[model samples]
Target chain A: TEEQKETLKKLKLYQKEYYDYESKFEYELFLLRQKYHDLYGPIYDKRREALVGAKIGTPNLPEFWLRALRNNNTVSHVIEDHDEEILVYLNDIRCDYGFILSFYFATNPFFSNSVLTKTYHMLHTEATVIDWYDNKNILKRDSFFHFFTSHKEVAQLEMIIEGDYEVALTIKERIIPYAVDYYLGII
Target chain B: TEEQKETLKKLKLYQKEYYDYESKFEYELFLLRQKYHDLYGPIYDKRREALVGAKIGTPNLPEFWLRALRNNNTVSHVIEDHDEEILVYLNDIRCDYGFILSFYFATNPFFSNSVLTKTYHMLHTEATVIDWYDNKNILKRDSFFHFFTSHKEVAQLEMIIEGDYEVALTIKERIIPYAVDYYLGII
Candidate 1:
């Protein structure tokens, strides 16, 4: 009927208005998250230095990153007992875009590289190649350490990619926000 | 010793700055959600009237709400075959807070009440009491219709409360926004 058509036309316009506002909300929220993350940078760097012996005349805090990761359920599930030895060297994590997650480490016996990264794009994700010591590549075995290896092992890289992104969220939200609580097992 | 104290003080100030911005972002985001919801209101009312025989000179659309629920993944899981007869009378669902969800129905054989609601508070959820016909109360058995009944059945109301809130999101984010696509199975 003519009435139905008129009604639907108005409804369509309204739907578009609603959609526009929602788009605006989402875009603004993205910028807000990015802004706060940038604000958090220098403090995180200072926290890292204090905990990693990078500061002059100050003793380093032990097991800060390892304890935080272990306290988290989603993160802890992937950590094998052997993974802790490597995690102890985790100095900091650099959070950024392509939606990139970079794990910065101090000098370690296992891998010579100071950073391992996962960069997510629209279709595919990129993993970092580790410079492993002879016969010491933990990526050869199943563990949290696999997060830093080449994507050749992921038969369907799509499945592992989703899980990896979720872990990045845990790292960004929980590991970063409540670092003191996670380190002390309070949260 | 003084250098270490100075670093800690600087880190503390920066951390406070970071926390302040995060709090501001969250507060502003809440208002943005509320504002868009208000803008979407009159359109939703018009859409409801046109589909439910409330608008003058317009024939009512049949099974609009039913089809929408069935199309949704999370919302459909709770619906049973018996529920459809009752849901055929379903006209519109209200969206709001304490976070509240109200389902409105036309005159139906099973119940006298025109509205059923689930109101979520900080500690618990409240369900509407359906005024059922003699020996016609479907809530006596198991079905999605149970969503409108008293909370005596949910041993720990906490579990069902979370599930109910998630359904509200599907209704708000999916059903309301993309109604035409859902009806046509385009999305």
Candidate 2:
């Protein structure tokens, strides 16, 4: 019992120390999140959503999806289908594992006409449009990943799209991965 | 006995409840530790070790491995090798950067959290998620899972596996959730 008590005391001390440190970190982060929200305006936010809009590989793929890689001290490459492409919205410069490249494609819309629209609507009206062509039950990466990982509010990502007609059509994402597992288990 | 004797009256009044709660959490966690250690004990603090420890297939994984993931969240996936090992470093922001800091400290760990570039990384993003359904109603991501956004924290998590092993220095995240493993004798 004493040994067990000893272990708990040690663990508590560890927790205390960790919480102290974590608290400080979280406070700072919250402030940063607020700052980022303020810095990126509405227009920029809309463009980002349009990039990841219901379709993945439309004509806007080059404009919305392609990003320069920046290796942040590790050597690895291969973007997930759902990872919101930083290049889609950011213009100044972003990192992809040490690869410092400007998101010019997003900014340089003059070369392409697709980005000219301040307001645009998806050409496809059905959810099944996001499915693969062969129909072997192969779902598009962005279609599936976005269907789940896409959340209403991710840190650093402030204002996104807005509309009332979407209330019934848009699907709620299972943001947390655990819910995804539970969904698959049943299916 | 001397310490208890000094506070004997107070101890008698509160000791039972205090011990009951403290010991309950303590022993429960201890039993958890014993079981964890018994299963993965051989790799505690071992260089770059791998072990299947706790709460598999869920978000907010173990703190230590969370530290490792924080270090490499940007990573597309982890690399494995039977030949040699890689030294992975995970540090905690503890002060700034948002969720954890807000939960812990108020001085704002931002100034310090930001400057940890030499030793740490700021992982939380301040972006609001977009709506594919209605193209409206933006949401924020940090409201929940308000810890660190990225996997580059020094979480200092403890695993039950033995020998005073620290798993953070050697663990890596894989694309397929189930493939993720604890690596010992790695670095």
Candidate 3:
């Protein structure tokens, strides 16, 4: 019985360690995500301005992202007039995170909890796009936008940042049941 | 003693399950890593070509990344002419991975122990850069090039693609002793 108690304690302890890793990873990720916006958001805006300079139908930076998104076989159909607009919004948010690493550590007052809230809202819109795509897809592939959400590099990056989303999800799926069994003394 | 046996059995079983999850995650990650290169490599080359178009001193996409790396106080001091040359090589590798979800899904003849070998070589080059930087670090701050090894996003992404450089390193720092102790029945 003592050994059983000890084993349970050890399991709980390991779980605790994992939880700490998860939380810290998430916090750092949260900060990096904000740092991303703070750093790249301005550069992106500047690039957009430079591209949009003094002319109508002038090619701009965001269009590169938008065109890539449209080229994807999966994303092509779901894309709409207004949703095209949506991708532009999401693209800007996506831009803040991925292209360069310097932005992650740039000195900026805007890198705060506020950016998280802003990202939350942006992510919500991101969700909206995915849902619409799913609702329409009946499916999907990676595009420029696709890479942001689905690419392995991005996924791993996000997992580290967002608390290992899929890993956490899958682990929870397994561990919760395992924990229940373990608590009941069922190994 | 009977209970202890059962407890040990349970621990081993959980360990087995954990091992499976670990393996699967790594496999999926491996596939993603290759997909990243296959997908992004071409895009990067194309961008390079467009940027290099018969122009001397033409500002290009790589410049953006290079500028960011230089601006970082920490990376600045460590950077050298050779290191800058090194970045051009690493940048080629970096350019090799973005995705169209299917890239992640594609069946790869390339996925072998040999892929791991190839990845290891790339990782070696990666490490060389880091070591040179570390050796040269009279000072430091997060630089554009810094996150590829340090930041969770890049770190985990690199770990998955390149073999578990940081992931295994960090996990070993904590887990090896825990594992040994558990096996010795000392935990």
**Tens-digit lDDT track for model 1 on A37-156?**
776777777776665553211235556678888999989988998888888888877677657888888777888888888776756668788888998877776799777644425556
**What are the runs in model 1 whose C-alpha is more than 4 Å off?**
A1-3, A49-59, A139-141, A150-165, B1-14, B52-59, B139-142, B150-165
CAPRI-wise, candidate 2 is incorrect
Rank all candidate structures by their TM-score, best first, as comma-separated numbers. Answer: 1, 3, 2
Docking class of 1: acceptable
Per-prediction TM-score of chain B?
0.84, 0.22, 0.39
Cα shift from native, residue B61, model 1 (Å): 2.5
TM-score, structure 2 vs. true: 0.20
Residue-level lDDT for B131 in candidate 1? 88
Error of 2 at B184 (Å): 20
Cα lDDT for residue B110, model 3?
19
Candidate 2 DockQ score? 0.02
- lDDT string for model 1 (B1-187, tens) is 5755555555456556667877887887787778767767776787776677532112365677787788888889989888888887888877775567788888778888888887767566688888889988777666887665444266467676677667767876688777655655656
lDDT of 3 by residue, A63-165 (tens): 4334543553333444555444433432222222212111111112211111111122213222112323223431234222231232225666665336423
lDDT by residue for model 2 (A1-187), tens: 5643443344334434444544655565555544433433332333333333322221223322222222211101223433334224322211111111112223221222122111113321121122222423223243221221122345344322222113112211110111112212321
lDDT of 2 by residue, B1-104 (tens): 45324333332334233335445555655554445433322222221122111222111122333333433433213323210111121222122212112111
